[PDB]
Amino acid sequence: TSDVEERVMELITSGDVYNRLAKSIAPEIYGNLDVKKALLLLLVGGVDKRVGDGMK
Amino acid sequence: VDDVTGEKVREAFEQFLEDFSVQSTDTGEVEKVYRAQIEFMKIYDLNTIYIDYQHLSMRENGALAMAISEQYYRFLPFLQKGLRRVVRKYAPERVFQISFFNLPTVHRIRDIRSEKIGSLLSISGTVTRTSEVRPELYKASFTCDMCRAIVDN
Amino acid sequence: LRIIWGTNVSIQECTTNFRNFLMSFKYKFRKILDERDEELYYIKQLNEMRELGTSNLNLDARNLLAYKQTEDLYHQLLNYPQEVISIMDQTIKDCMVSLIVDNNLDYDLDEIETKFYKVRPYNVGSCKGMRELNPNDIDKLINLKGLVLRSTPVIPDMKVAFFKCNVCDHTMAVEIDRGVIQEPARCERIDCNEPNSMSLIHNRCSFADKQVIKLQETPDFVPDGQTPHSISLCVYDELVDSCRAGDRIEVTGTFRSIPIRANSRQRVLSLYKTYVDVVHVKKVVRQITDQDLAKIREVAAREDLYSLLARSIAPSIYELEDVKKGILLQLFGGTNKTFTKGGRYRGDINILLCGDPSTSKSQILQYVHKITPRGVYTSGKGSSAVGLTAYITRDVDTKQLVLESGALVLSDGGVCCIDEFDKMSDSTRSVLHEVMEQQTISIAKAGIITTLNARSSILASANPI
DNA sequence: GATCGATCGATAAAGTTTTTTTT
DNA sequence: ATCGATCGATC
Incomplete structure (x- = not known):
């Protein structure tokens, strides 16, 4: 929300997570929309747990 | 004033060589062990001595043995002069050395900062990558050939 | 003033x-860290300096910023940082004497009043690298955060000199x-x-x-x-x-800079080199x-200590009681029941495990690495x-020999945790039989x-094929 | 005999691709 | 090419 939010709201208004973002990244390939979804969640990763105790 | 102190430790060590540190009589431990140290030496001709830290600590009760622990970087060419005097009076080419052994404590190599300049400190460890056997000099007969080269520094 | x-x-x-x-502190700083202390840490610690005889006072030195006055002293520490510790x-010698003048029975006013104590202003300010x-x-004052790499042994320093010429006795210093x-x-x-041969007896004056x-x-x-750079x-x-x-x-370092000679044999010098001088450093038979x-004897009174140590070893692991038996038993690794003549047996044993892949095979071994410090x-x-022991390696400091011990010798007081015993090469997996047998x-x-x-x-910890 | 000036001599350099047995 | 040491000359 650091004054570029007018272009960040466009994802929140239009939505379209599952396919428009899939067609966004690497649109130069033949087919394979399923496998370009398997990478983008690794681009945001996903933290397992702030474990606190000795369980790394 | 260390000259006479060096002369004090000259004779006090020499007087220690006049006595023994023998505690038992004819149950083993024959008396006057330092006189026999001269006696074995005048047969096999090895040019050594062997003195321990115990029996020199337990004569002056540490009033003298504690002094040489911090000074015998300088006192080492002093005690050699006294034993060189007592040998002619007790025995018939003569170079020697001073061989202390068996101090109480044992240190590691990581403990040498400031007190270890001129001290005596038994050190353990292992040994690797030796070298050869070369000669050293310690005394010259060299002099200039201007008039006569017989100056012996 | 001067x-x-x-x-x-x-x-x-x-x-x-x-x-x-x-002396008249007893508490401060309650306002900068407002939460809601009856006596100062230093007040007890200044009494604690004499009764151990140490020379070091690790001053936090963020107390002058909490105090109303002494800001001028505080903002002269960070601007002339050599005379202020010299003052x-x-x-601190006199402020210690300020306690001995009350109680004259404190170490006879002579011998501890000879060795000069010192101070250490640490954790002051903040800094962010290079x-x-x-x-x-x-x-x-600079506050570095980093990592040291390699050390050299101590070299001496000219703190006092000595002289003697060629006369009979003249021993000036x-x-x-x-x-x-x-x-x-x-x-x-x-x-x-x-005017004659004044000589320099070097191995006499202390360093x-x-x-x-x-x-x-x-x-x-x-x-x-x-690239992460370096400083000495x-x-x-x-x-x-x-x-x-x-x-x-x-x-907690001060700052300095030195000149260097360009040619090795002239007095010529001009791009300088800096270096820091540390006053205090910080990382981050038991008593x-x-x-x-007394606490474990309550636990030793409990008969289920085997079961109590069965449940304590697993903070997340499934139950599996059989593997938990020998692990604490190997950690309770016997003793050296050694005879004078004959035998030389030791009670140490050796467990193993293999089977299903990734059943916390490594994390249990990581958990055993937690419970043993060495x-x-x-x-x-x-x-x-050849990479375990028996080295020849041409090190970058002296290019000479060094014999560093292998990990099996390095566990003198621990437990050798080792893996990949089906992919280990057959050039090795031949010397562990000797440490199995002659322990050498x-x-x-x-x-x-x-x-x-x-x-x-x-x-x-083996693996299937 | 000591001090100053002039002349002569000595002091500074740098490496890391081909080829052998061997495991 | 510069610096240091030694020798010679002058005061």
Whole structure:
């Protein structure tokens, strides 16, 4: 929300997570929309747990 | 004033060589062990001595043995002069050395900062990558050939 | 008050301004860290300096910012940081004497009043690495965060000199106190002692310690392209060989700069080299009490200690009671029941496990690495047959021989945790039988022979095929 | 005999691709 | 090419 939010709201208004973002990244390939979804969640990763105790 | 102190430790060590540190009589431990140290030496001709830290600590009760622990970087060419005097009076080419052994404590190599300049400190460890056997000099007969080269520094 | 050509510092008001601040404190700083302390830490600790006789007072030195006055002293510490510690070493001797004048039975007023105590202003200010150290920072406190790499042993330093010429007895001892040694050009000690051979007996005057350590900063949010650079260290006090190489570190250093000679044999010099001088450093038989022995005897009164140690070893692991038996049993690794003649048996045993892949096979081994402070950890070809022990390696400091021990000898007081015992090469997996049997490693290297032992204890974590 | 000036002599350099047995 | 040491000359 650091004054570029007018272009960040466009994802929140239009939505379209599952396919428009899939067609966004690497649109130069033949087919394979399923496998370009398997990478983008690794681009945001996903933290397992702030474990606190000795369980790394 | 260390000259006479060096002369004090000259004779006090020499007087220690006049006595023994023998505690038992004819149950083993024959008396006057330092006189026999001269006696074995005048047969096999090895040019050594062997003195321990115990029996020199337990004569002056540490009033003298504690002094040489911090000074015998300088006192080492002093005690050699006294034993060189007592040998002619007790025995018939003569170079020697001073061989202390068996101090109480044992240190590691990581403990040498400031007190270890001129001290005596038994050190353990292992040994690797030796070298050869070369000669050293310690005394010259060299002099200039201007008039006569017989100056012996 | 006095005035120096260099500084603008005062006379001993700030010492007295500290001494009333030191003694009449009892609490401060309650407002900057507002949460809601009856007596100051230092007040008990200043009594604690004499009764142990130590020389070091680790001053937090963020107390002058909490105090109303002594800001001028506080903002002269960070601007002339050599005279201010040179002032306060005199005061702490007198402020200790300020306690001995009350109780005259405190160490006879002579012998502890000879060894000079000192102080250590640490954790002051904040700093952020190396890409901010401007040339204006000439004499300031710096707070580095980084990592030391490698050390050299102590070399000596000219703190006192000695002289003797060729007369009978003349044993003067000049001082240096600079980078300059001063000599006489004509003799002394007698009337007819003209200008002659004044000689330098070097191995007689005493020296202190000194040590240089190399540091390289940790990559702490570096912008992923910049190479982490380096800077050196230097120390003077009794901190030599108390900071081993290879740990996270913080230093409380001042700043200096030295000249260098370009040619090795002239007095010519001009791009300088800086280095820091540390005042205090910080990283980040146990003292056996009797309450712990009383606490475990309550647990030793409980018969289910086997079951109590069965449940304690697994904070997350599934139950599996059979594997938990020998693991604590191997950790309870017997003793050396050794006879005088014959035998030399030791009660150490060796468990192993293999089977289903990734059933916390490694994390259990990581968990065993937690419970023992002095142990090993195997690697994937971090060690090898010749890479374990028996080294020849041409090190970058002296290019000579070094015999570093392998991990099996390195576990003298631990448990050898080792893995990959189906992918290990058959050049190795041939010397562990000897440490299984004669408890030793026989070294056949070009350097030397040695039948050194290895007080060891092993477990094996294999894998299916 | 000592001090100053002039002349002569000595002092500074740098490496890391082909080829052998061997495991 | 520069610096240091030694020798010679002058006061």
